[PDB]
Amino acid sequence: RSLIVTTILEEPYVLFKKSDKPLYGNDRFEGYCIDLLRELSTILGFTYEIRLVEDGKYGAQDDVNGQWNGMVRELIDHKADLAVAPLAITYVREKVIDFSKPFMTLGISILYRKPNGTNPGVFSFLNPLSPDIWMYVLLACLGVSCVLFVIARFSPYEWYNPHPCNPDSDVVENNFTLLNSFWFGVGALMQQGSELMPKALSTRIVGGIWWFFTLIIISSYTANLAAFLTVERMESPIDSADDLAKQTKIEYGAVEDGATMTFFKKSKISTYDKMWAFMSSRRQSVLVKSNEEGIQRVLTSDYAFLMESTTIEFVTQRNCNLTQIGGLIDSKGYGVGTPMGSPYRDKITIAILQLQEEGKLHMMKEKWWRGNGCPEEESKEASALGVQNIGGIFIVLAAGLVLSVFVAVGEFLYKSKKNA
Amino acid sequence: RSLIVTTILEEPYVLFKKSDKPLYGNDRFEGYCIDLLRELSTILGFTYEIRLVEDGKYGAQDDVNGQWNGMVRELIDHKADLAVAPLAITYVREKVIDFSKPFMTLGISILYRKPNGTNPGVFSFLNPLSPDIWMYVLLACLGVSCVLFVIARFSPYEWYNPHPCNPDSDVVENNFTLLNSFWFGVGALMQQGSELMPKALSTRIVGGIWWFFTLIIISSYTANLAAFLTVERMESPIDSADDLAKQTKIEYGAVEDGATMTFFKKSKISTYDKMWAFMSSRRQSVLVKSNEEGIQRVLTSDYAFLMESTTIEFVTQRNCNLTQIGGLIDSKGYGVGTPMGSPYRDKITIAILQLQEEGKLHMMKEKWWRGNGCPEEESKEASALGVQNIGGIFIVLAAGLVLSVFVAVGEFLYKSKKNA
Amino acid sequence: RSLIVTTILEEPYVLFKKSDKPLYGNDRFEGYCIDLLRELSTILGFTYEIRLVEDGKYGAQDDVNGQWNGMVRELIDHKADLAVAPLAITYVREKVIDFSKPFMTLGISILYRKPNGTNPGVFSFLNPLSPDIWMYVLLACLGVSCVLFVIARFSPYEWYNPHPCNPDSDVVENNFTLLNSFWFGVGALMQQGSELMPKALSTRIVGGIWWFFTLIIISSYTANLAAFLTVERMESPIDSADDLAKQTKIEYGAVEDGATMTFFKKSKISTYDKMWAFMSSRRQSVLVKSNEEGIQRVLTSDYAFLMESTTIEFVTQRNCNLTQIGGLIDSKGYGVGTPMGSPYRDKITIAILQLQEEGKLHMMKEKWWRGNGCPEEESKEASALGVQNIGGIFIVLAAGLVLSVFVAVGEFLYKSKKNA
Amino acid sequence: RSLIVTTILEEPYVLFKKSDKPLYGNDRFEGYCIDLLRELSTILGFTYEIRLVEDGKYGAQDDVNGQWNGMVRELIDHKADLAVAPLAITYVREKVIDFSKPFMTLGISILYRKPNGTNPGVFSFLNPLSPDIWMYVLLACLGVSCVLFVIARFSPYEWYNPHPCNPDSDVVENNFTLLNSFWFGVGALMQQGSELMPKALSTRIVGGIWWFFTLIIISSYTANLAAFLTVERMESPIDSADDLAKQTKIEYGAVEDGATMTFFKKSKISTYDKMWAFMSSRRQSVLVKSNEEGIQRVLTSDYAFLMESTTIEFVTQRNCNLTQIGGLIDSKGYGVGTPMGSPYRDKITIAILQLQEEGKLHMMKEKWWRGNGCPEEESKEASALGVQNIGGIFIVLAAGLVLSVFVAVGEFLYKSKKNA
């Protein structure tokens, strides 16, 4: 004899080969379950010929007559001897056909968009104060220093004798010129002082007020930056279903009429019926029809699509903009199907389990689920301040030293134009 | 026998279900009172056929006719057999129809807009130190500078040679006068320092202690401001009905001739007389016509709305800038109405207590009153300090620059009088 | 006739009067349910005589013969016409006796020790650095300054000419004496500088290293104090059962074989069976026998005793070391009992509800549950730095200014002892 | 008919129940495998009488006799009928007894001690800025000070009269030499300032830009250190079995001749050969005798223990300094054993899948593997910075005080050579 093996088209499962050569038979197919049946027929000795299921399904009761469809109809009507396909071992299907013992473990977990890290900008040190404030601090430096200049020329006490070494007269002068009064204000703003230090009482009230103003500006820059950096460090992305249960900004997802949304119907867990309450409320928006459109929803919007774990690890690892957040929720298992009471059930159970002990079923999964390089290496770290978030203080340093050369040229010419 | 359950429409009690189809009947309705009624029909055995109430009214007795309107008129004339609805147990209806024991407990409570933190005060920089500390730092600046004056006089090593360029001219000068002693005190307080730098040992111990004092004050101002800006604890101006008795700025409000207005009119408690003396001797500014119009006036104006308790936890839950301040004022309950003398009063009374001890009567409330959830408990980024947050250092800058010109013209006259 | 009213001894319920006068009958008793039956007999016209229940209980099936005991045995055997007592309206008791409609609402909530606020001490500013560090910073000031003194006398470049005004010789001197080198180190430590500023290259390496050392000390004092003050502000006491469900440090409690622990048996809520899992694990330690010993466990240890809400509001308000955290979990109701099918059930239901509309049942609760003054006013606030947590910088300020007077006396004598 | 269920004792699978009493039988035992067995007997109809296994062994085949030991010897000789226990499905037992389908899924995983944060490094003050920034600040201090040298030479207004006491002696001096230009650069960087204070305009723009540069660096060091000390993100040195292949410092470990040791011996994967080449060519330092002895060696030493997966989530849960690093390595499952050919293999296979689809098979795991919980996720107070946290500023202090003496004796020779 030759066993009629019913299977379905899926990836990395039974596929077609990508060549032209239009005379294929039993070389037409290539996938995980073709490599599995190649290694089951090798050690059990049988020969096989693959015949795809006609009505493109896995199997379910249509409830109109209690007749199964898909692959498990061909198994229950003995039109097929095996079923090497992702036919998950479940309760209602166990009572009609007999499965082997699992060759793969799956479960419900979450697709999500891999965290696109926010570039802070190069000028991200300006952030702890609003741009209304950074302008009003600059207009306070041009304001107070033009007030201190007027008061220093108007007050008699600031006019001092610069020579205590020689008790003269008529040499009485100020040190607060227009340029020095700017240098007091800029010097006091940066908390590093200057060499002027007012002498009258009226110019010290301008001084002592500008010093109290300055402490509140620096201590509200340091404290708000220590609030921006401890909010960013305290927060964390979703890494579970519980953190996905609370935040209603992140939109959920499931296949309409599938085995994933069926789990949230029959669930009695208090964290999963809340997820069904989200899916029952926002239905027609969080209940997309298949696995293919559900990936395109995560790729565009803030979608959190719930599907099985073996077709996340395929999708995630050939598309490194996508990730798997959380762990396994359910725990299913793919099993090689047999008709009810078949002799090949006990041989394949021993044959699948022989390939696990010699490590075949991991070397086959790493051949088909691995894929390209996919640069995901991507050592994301945080909170150590680098060039990417404090680097614009290097630019305005360099922009201030280019400008100061242009004034040193402007000073060396202006002196020589006075001399000549 | 199908008994004719009467029903008024409230949310989330009895709503219109909407999917697509024209043909209807007993599937139009969903909510709390429908899940209550189908779980009583499961336990007691009866059948619905909910039919709605006419004249859209719960029940009241006319003042000149002496007749009833709505459900309790439909129950007294046996045009209904149950009244599963928000029909509150009161004295006048209990003498006319027969209620079951309560299935919900409620009272009068207060809506108010949730605290926002968008106008914290224009002097919000002043908050990280208590106003005891802001005075005791200023008295310490006056205290140390008076000690700096006293110590520097009779310390003989603070009497140096102020004439350094020539070797031994017998002149002596103390640069720690009364004016410079405050300027060292202010100058060291503002982390920038004067030009003085005391010189013996006894003014250096005063100098070194006031410097260590100043680090601990500034590094506690910067640290406590860093705590205020990442952990914002927003507190409401009102916390109970006693705090509304004093705040005339926050105005009351209730529905005209409702069950809430009737309670404050008939009360004898000293707070609830003061709450009624406002609401009676003011109208159309404080008394709304419907509670849906009253939810809007909290949302727009500065308004505190006195309404039923269980209507609040529905509206608060799906509008996250509305909160419930305080606790229950009144205490009443919702009862399934029955006609005046019925066998269905007792058998539902047992059936309500069966739903409450098994836990199903609480799980209906948790699914119909809960909504989005809106987790704003996670702190956002600290919302950069603008003229609404720091703000008042621009005032005390201008208040110091105006005061200094008064001293500038003040000490201009004192020298011009001295030169004359 | 005269109604035989069966009741039980509890507080603020039926008690004895505190006088001697040993000939009481029907004046023997004083409580809430005596004030209730005084106001029910007034408006219904009946006369009554109180007879206490003999076997000191409320009522339950003993399961040996299905015979009720306590008060509801005297009701079911018609030895009593009423039961005005805390006889909670529950399901198994409703089917044998008939209750009135509730005069009081109770529920399950939590006793807990009222938060005894931690006094930070007066020296709580020392906290951001360990006492090993504050000693090693003081020994670095006595270390570096005694290194800078040796290097300044040993290096030739620090020996400068103090007269550029007069190009002399032999007047070459240092400004780094032993006292000034201490004043550089103390002056640089406090981030406010001095008037010395080293001139050689060897004394600037000591200077530049002591300045880098100083920045790390101040920036680790400011950042650790901004971590001590944002952990204290972020944390919050338990204010629910969910916050009480997680923390296993806080020990739970319940009455053994009571109506409170029965609620956690039949619970299907995911946050309450976890509380039963704590009570099933640590039983004989969290399952004390009555309400009286359970209060004494909260008063000594970290106990979180679960009892009914009407005997928390009694205990909390006459003992202001105790508080009620969270809200109502269950929702029961105290009802005036009647025998099965009694005519007084419908009259008292109208009579209780008449006293609610004219506000008697709140004025009676505020007479018996109010109690003494009990200074609980206690306006607890936090995070504004006051005298109680930064006040020891006022003491060491004052201790440094007392010491400096004693050196100014020591300087004024030492000069005059040189002069004389 | 009572069928004789065999059983080995493991925790939390089958334990001894202890209350008080001597007389026993089928109530001695509680756990996962007993709650599994009484829920199979409810569904399938059968009865227990659990009897224990002799010789305390699961099952293995003797190498010289060719006989079995324990449960699978008790199943092959029909001295038992079920084997509800942790009896892992393997190839050699499947050829001898018949298993059901799995009820637990597990594999090989890694114990390691949870990260602690008690030795963060003695240079942990250096962390808030990246080592790119710590170099670029130092090059900017060298860069600006070389620009300060160049600009101050050919700027004519930096050439003042250094002889102020006498009016017009034609001497000129630039105080911005090469040595003072770095000292202004270092002095302004350390927030304390030199004695220079540039004087024209072009050295004031260099001065004012380097001052604004310095505020942003210090207020980002203080702010990011304030983020590190309140939000501590502790990360392990190892994250998978690939990271143990390189870390020879962290040593492996597994039970002698267990199911874990057998997997690494027979493997062909390149990581698991390197993990075995260590463990085979080292013994009694890396190979434990029992896994209880291996939990202790993680707890004491620096050790990473390779054991079964479901034994980890029991031990990790009730010892909160033990964690599971990585994921599952192997993949096997626990099966209810049956004799070689039985009608109870199929009917339990359906019954296990009935428990798994209803959700009861997961709720048994959540009640027997979960323990205390230990919420250390809430941040404690920041644990004051000692010599383990700041630490290395005491080294770079002493490294700068030793280097300065070398320059002090260095420039002592250079002047003594010049004077000669």
Ligand SMILES: CCCCCCCC/C=C/CCCCCCCC(=O)O[C@@H](COC(=O)CCCCCCCCCCCCCCC)COP(=O)([O-])OCC[N+](C)(C)C
């Ligand atoms: C402790 C600190 C406070 C105390 C000191 C305060 C110092 C006074 C400062 C005053 C004004 C500072 C400029 C800010 C203007 C607001 C606009 C803005 O921020 O955005 C602009 C950046 O702006 C720049 O280009 C930064 C230039 C810095 C100027 C250096 C001042 C020199 C000191 C002289 C002192 C006074 C001279 C007086 C003369 C006598 C546009 O960039 P962006 O679009 O935002 O890109 C980022 C976008 N992203 C993050 C979203 C990705």
Ligand SMILES: CCCCCCCC/C=C/CCCCCCCC(=O)O[C@@H](COC(=O)CCCCCCCCCCCCCCC)COP(=O)([O-])OCC[N+](C)(C)C
């Ligand atoms: C880095 C900082 C620490 C170190 C520096 C410490 C420096 C010592 C400072 C000591 C005193 C500082 C102010 C104390 C105010 C206490 C009274 C109060 O709380 O309310 C009053 C504040 O209204 C004002 O008085 C505004 C004045 C602010 C600046 C005053 C000093 C000017 C600088 C002088 C320079 C030399 C000073 C020293 C030499 C004499 C009333 O207004 P309000 O009620 O707040 O309205 C908002 C309501 N809200 C906030 C509730 C929303």
Ligand SMILES: CCCCCCCC/C=C/CCCCCCCC(=O)O[C@@H](COC(=O)CCCCCCCCCCCCCCC)COP(=O)([O-])OCC[N+](C)(C)C
């Ligand atoms: C930004 C700040 C860092 C930079 C500046 C560092 C300055 C250097 C400081 C060095 C030592 C500081 C003393 C602390 C010693 C450790 C012991 C301790 O803390 O507890 C003791 C307190 O200790 C005191 O009594 C505080 C006295 C302050 C000293 C004033 C400094 C003088 C400046 C001169 C500078 C050097 C002179 C050199 C001369 C050439 C005992 O109190 P307690 O039992 O803890 O009570 C609280 C208990 N509770 C909280 C649990 C309730």
Ligand SMILES: CCCCCCCC/C=C/CCCCCCCC(=O)O[C@@H](COC(=O)CCCCCCCCCCCCCCC)COP(=O)([O-])OCC[N+](C)(C)C
């Ligand atoms: C407020 C502060 C900001 C503003 C001021 C900035 C000042 C400019 C500073 C610039 C450079 C600062 C240090 C650079 C360190 C980078 C290398 C590194 O990361 O590791 C190396 C650090 O080993 C060392 O180098 C220790 C030296 C620290 C002080 C060096 C300058 C001394 C003061 C000079 C005075 C003049 C300086 C300027 C004039 C020239 C190797 O050791 P590790 O690997 O770390 O071992 C621990 C491992 N762990 C951390 C992972 C646990």
Ligand SMILES: CCCCCCCC/C=C\CCCCCCCC(=O)O[C@@H](COC(=O)CCCCCCCCCCCCCCC)COP(=O)([O-])OCC[N+](C)(C)C
């Ligand atoms: C060339 C020389 C010119 C002169 C030099 C001076 C110029 C330069 C110097 C300082 C000004 C800085 C320039 C920036 C512009 C300031 C505007 C601003 O920020 O608004 C601030 C107002 O603060 C004020 O400026 C008004 C002044 C206070 C009242 C007048 C003084 C009397 C104070 C007491 C009487 C005693 C006085 C006597 C005591 C003996 C705050 O605005 P706001 O209300 O919070 O707006 C809300 C915005 N929101 C909607 C977002 C929430």
Ligand SMILES: *[C@@H]1O[C@H](CO)[C@@H](O[C@@H]2O[C@H](CO)[C@@H](O)[C@H](O)[C@H]2NC(C)=O)[C@H](O)[C@H]1NC(C)=O
């Ligand atoms: C607040 O003060 C009370 C004083 O009664 C402290 O209560 C003591 O608590 C300890 C355990 O922490 C018990 O061993 C003592 O028996 C209690 N005292 C008495 C008199 O019973 C309480 O601990 C304080 N609060 C805090 C948070 O420590």
Ligand SMILES: O=S1(=O)NCN(C2CC2)c2ccc(F)cc21
């Ligand atoms: O359908 S099964 O054969 N039996 C049920 N389950 C488990 C819950 C462990 C699992 C889990 C993983 C599988 F691969 C198979 C099965």
Ligand SMILES: O=S1(=O)NCN(C2CC2)c2ccc(F)cc21
């Ligand atoms: O209208 S009732 O049936 N009887 C009176 N009361 C109260 C005693 C407060 C209450 C309290 C809560 C209810 F749910 C019902 C009633």
Ligand SMILES: O=S1(=O)NCN(C2CC2)c2ccc(F)cc21
């Ligand atoms: O025993 S009852 O008459 N009916 C049940 N409940 C519930 C509201 C659930 C309540 C709640 C409070 C009561 F006062 C009485 C009752």
Ligand SMILES: O=S1(=O)NCN(C2CC2)c2ccc(F)cc21
């Ligand atoms: O020993 S099995 O019954 N068959 C083999 N395998 C795996 C293919 C992974 C698994 C995986 C998980 C199980 F629970 C059981 C088995």
Ligand SMILES: *[C@@H]1O[C@H](CO)[C@@H](O)[C@H](O)[C@H]1NC(C)=O
């Ligand atoms: C706390 O102490 C006792 C409890 O032993 C109590 O009687 C007293 O009233 C309480 N005191 C205050 C101030 O709350």
Ligand code: NA
């Ligand atoms: Na079957």
Ligand code: NA
């Ligand atoms: Na009635």
